[PDB]
A paper describes a structure:
SUFU is an essential intracellular negative regulator of mammalian Hedgehog signalling and acts by binding and modulating the activity of GLI transcription factors. Hedgehog signalling plays a fundamental role in the control of metazoan development, cell proliferation and differentiation, as highlighted by the fact that its deregulation is associated with the development of many human tumours. Here, the crystal and small-angle X-ray scattering structures of full-length human SUFU and its complex with the key SYGHL motif conserved in all GLIs are reported. It is demonstrated that GLI binding is associated with major conformational changes in SUFU, including an intrinsically disordered loop that is also crucial for pathway activation.
Although the crystallized protein was intact, both SUFU molecules in the orthorhombic asymmetric unit show no apparent density for the C-terminal domain residues 279–360, suggesting that this region of the molecule is highly mobile. Since disorder often impacts crystal diffraction quality, we generated a new construct (MBP-SUFU-Δ) in which these 82 residues were replaced with a shorter seven-residue loop. This construct was expressed and purified in the same way as MBP-SUFU-FL and crystallized both in the presence (crystal form I) and absence (crystal form II) of maltose. The fold of MBP-SUFU-Δ is essentially the same as for the full-length protein, demonstrating that the disordered residues are not critical for protein folding or overall stability. Collectively, these results imply that the IDR in SUFU is dispensable for GLI binding and repression activity in cells without upstream pathway activation.
Residue numbers in the entry: 3 to 615, 626 to 713, 722 to 742
Write the structure that this text describes.
């Protein structure tokens, strides 16, 4: 925000210019500059940035969002003298009251209406069922019957609710968030009807707000569906239009979700009193509302005085008839999640991606899945561009006996950063490792503190190939494999961990057959009522790189991968095509690993190797035998472990034999400085004092190799071992 200046956000389809004129008058009378912006996806931007401390002093939007905003603590409480509260209709105040407090100034009442071309269609239909036949009549003379935005569920909700659909059941003043009604026969009936319209080529699933508006206003289609804001543009057009009641479906009224355009004050705003002055004494006046209304009609206003003038307009009348027949939107926080569920359901059902029953079943479950929704939020923040990415769904859900524990795996196109030389890739995000539903169907509920589910979800970044229109799906199957491992082992992962796989990740001949895990570079962790969720990105590595990771640590090797862009880069993007290890690409990298093992120690506690040396015996002489391969690890054993007071264990692949190098100062060994070499059966422990260890290392500064010291002998060999 800012002090002495007023920043306002309002959607671009509203009358921002009129509002700007009111801002001009305010700037004249008070000297405070009033800036009016209309960013895309503002409502979302607003929750997103309000916390950091950027944001609008005032935010305009339908009330349905505000309850959420208020629960997050983004909104200041508004305080009007009774003198002012009486100027507005009580029910508009109702729409903006949350948890007993007023959290926004109600501005206007928005409801969708059926807008029709009087020239093309003298008497509009009273029912949806006529439209198919009606379209056919018009198609005969190169026109269409109906076109409206199919991308926002706001416009198809009236039809869906008509025969029984609902968001949350309201009884006794309480909305039951668990009782969602988008899955019932009614909702199925309306959405099935829309889908059938598209099947019989009376509508097109691609159609959006702008195509619908252009079509109707140019006079290409007979009808459209929209709110009062739209009219101004139609007035400019050649079309003579009427605004009327929406068509009935199966004998029942269409029930549009009525909104109440409201203005909220940012809790992080310095100028809150300036905001109150502007809204109460400048905007919410006959003069202010008229100013805005000339630009784009607001609908049925909340200011009694001005509304009395407006109510005469037959268009407003129709607006209020549709409004009455429909319901007013709830303002609870769960609305946003509901809207998202339905938006996906409609689009997928209309495009043929899914059936009506499957889409609505998914929307039904997802309307009340705070975890799935809290993740979808962050996904939405990263990809405001992509509302519905290709998404792999597990059709037999895990908690019904299904094999795949990941309910969903979303697949995004990431454009990368040209400035950072980061290539375009596909970004897979998984859903199911965390608590999505929080009703104990998969994961025990644990509360807000602590990890939701296993506390993380999996992500993956697959370098996009030349001409790849769509992301491949094999990474989802991979993610299902890992997910199963976690679910059966009950074993969590942390940034740095490695996964040994030893098969091409993509079931090709690729050299990438193992995985490392790191924090997703872009995905921020999220607060889920069911817990906190972090995002672990999978990074494909060669067998050599995995080995480096075991010998040193995961973290170091990931960074090495970041420096070699071809092998990952800053965001650690997996290229299944890669043919060389990072070490074949830059040998100085091996050097970096050796320095790390020296100064960090190594995470390798033991190896299965070709090698050789109940009562706890003691020995004064010891002769070890090693394969070249296990002989290679001796420096690691000493430099990497004993010099860090860490023990190391060779176990013979055949034998029951074992050799555990023990630093002076390790705990629980049966080897003492007094008696360094001791054995319990086939298991041998030898304790080396640090000085001797250093000496030994210098001595090791190819085959056969023999070493001797006063105490003990060491042999390096090739085929004595079977
Ligand atoms: O698409 C779902 C959407 O519906 C409503 O958004 C309306 C808004 O109320 C109107 O003022 C106008 O801008 O049309 C919007 C839809 O394009 C809800 O208010 C919103 O929360 C929801 O996302």
């Amino acid at each position: 925000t800012e002090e002495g200046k007023l920043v306002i956000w309002i959607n671009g389809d509203k009358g921002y210019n009129g509002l700007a004129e009111v801002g001009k008058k305010f700037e004249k009378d008070t000297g405070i500059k009033v800036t009016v912006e209309h960013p895309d996806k503002l409502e979302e931007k607003f929750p997103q940035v309000a916390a950091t401390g950027d944001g609008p002093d005032i935010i305009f939007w339908a009330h349905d969002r505000f309850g959420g905003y208020a629960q997050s603590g983004l909104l200041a409480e508004i305080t009007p003298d009774k003198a002012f509260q009486d100027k507005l209709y009580p029910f508009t105040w109702d729409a903006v009251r949350y948890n007993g407090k007023l959290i926004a100034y109600p501005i206007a009442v928005e409801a969708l209406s059926l807008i029709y071309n009087k020239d093309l269609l003298p008497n509009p239909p009273k029912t949806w069922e006529e439209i198919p036949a009606l379209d056919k009549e018009l198609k005969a003379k190169g026109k269409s019957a109906l076109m409206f935005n199919l991308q926002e569920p706001y416009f198809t909700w009236p039809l869906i609710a008509a025969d029984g659909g609902y968001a949350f059941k309201y009884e006794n003043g309480k909305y039951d968030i668990k009782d969602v009604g988008v899955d019932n026969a009614g909702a199925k009936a309306g959405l099935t009807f829309l889908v059938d319209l598209i099947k019989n080529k009376h509508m097109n699933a691609d159609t959006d707000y702008s195509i619908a508006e252009a079509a109707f206003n140019k006079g290409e289609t007979a009808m459209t569906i929209n709110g009062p804001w739209a009219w101004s543009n139609i007035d400019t057009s050649k079309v003579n239009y009427g605004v009327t009641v929406l068509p009935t479906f199966k004998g029942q009224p269409s029930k549009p979700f009525v909104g109440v355009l409201s203005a909220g004050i940012n809790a992080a705003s310095p100028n809150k009193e300036l905001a109150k002055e502007f809204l109460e004494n400048y905007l919410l006046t006959d003069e202010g509302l008229e100013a805005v209304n000339k630009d784009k009609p607001l609908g049925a206003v909340a200011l009694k005085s001005y509304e009395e003038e407006l109510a005469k307009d037959p268009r407003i009348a129709a607006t209020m008839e549709n409004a009455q027949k429909g319901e007013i939107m709830p303002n609870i926080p769960q609305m946003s999640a509901f809207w998202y569920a339905v938006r996906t359901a409609v689009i997928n059902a209309a495009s043929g991606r899914q059936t009506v029953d499957a889409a609505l079943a998914a929307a039904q479950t997802n309307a009340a899945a705070p975890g799935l929704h809290a993740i979808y939020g962050e996904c939405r923040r990263l990809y405001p561009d992509q509302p519905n990415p290709l998404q792999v769904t597990a059709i037999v859900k895990y908690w019904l006996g299904g094999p795949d524990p990941l309910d969903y795996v979303s697949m995004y196109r990431n454009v990368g950063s040209p400035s950072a030389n980061i290539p375009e890739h596909w970004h897979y995000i998984s859903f199911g490792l965390s608590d999505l539903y929080g009703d104990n169907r998969v994961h025990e509920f644990t509360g807000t503190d602590g990890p939701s589910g296993f506390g993380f979800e999996l992500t993956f970044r697959l370098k996009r190939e030349t001409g790849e229109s769509a992301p491949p799906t094999w990474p989802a199957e991979l993610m299902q494999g890992l997910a199963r491992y976690v679910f059966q082992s009950e074993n969590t992962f942390c940034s740095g961990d490695h996964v040994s796989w030893h098969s091409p990740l993509d079931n090709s001949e690729s050299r990438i057959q193992h995985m490392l895990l790191t924090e997703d570079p872009q995905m921020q962790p999220v607060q889920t009522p069911f817990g906190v969720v972090t995002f672990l990105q999978i990074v494909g590595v060669c067998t050599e790189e995995l080995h480096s990771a075991q010998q040193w640590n995961g973290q170091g090797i990931l960074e090495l991968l970041r420096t070699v862009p071809i092998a990952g880069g800053p965001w650690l993007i997996t290229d299944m095509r890669r043919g060389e290890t990072i070490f074949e690409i830059d040998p100085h990298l091996q050097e970096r690993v050796d320095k790390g093992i020296e100064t960090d120690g190594s995470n390798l506690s033991g190896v299965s190797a070709k090698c050789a040396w109940i009562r706890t015996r003691q020995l004064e002489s010891v002769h070890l035998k090693f394969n070249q391969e296990s002989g290679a690890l001796i420096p690691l054993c000493l430099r990497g472990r004993l010099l860090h007071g860490r023990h190391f264990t060779y176990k013979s692949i055949t034998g029951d034999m074992a050799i555990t190098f023990v630093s002076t100062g390790v705990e629980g060994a049966f080897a003492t400085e007094e008696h360094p070499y001791a054995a319990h059966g086939p298991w041998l422990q030898i304790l080396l004092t640090e000085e001797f260890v250093e000496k030994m290392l210098e001595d090791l500064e190819k085959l056969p190799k023999e070493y001797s010291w006063p105490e003990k002998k060491l042999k390096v060999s090739i085929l004595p071992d079977v």
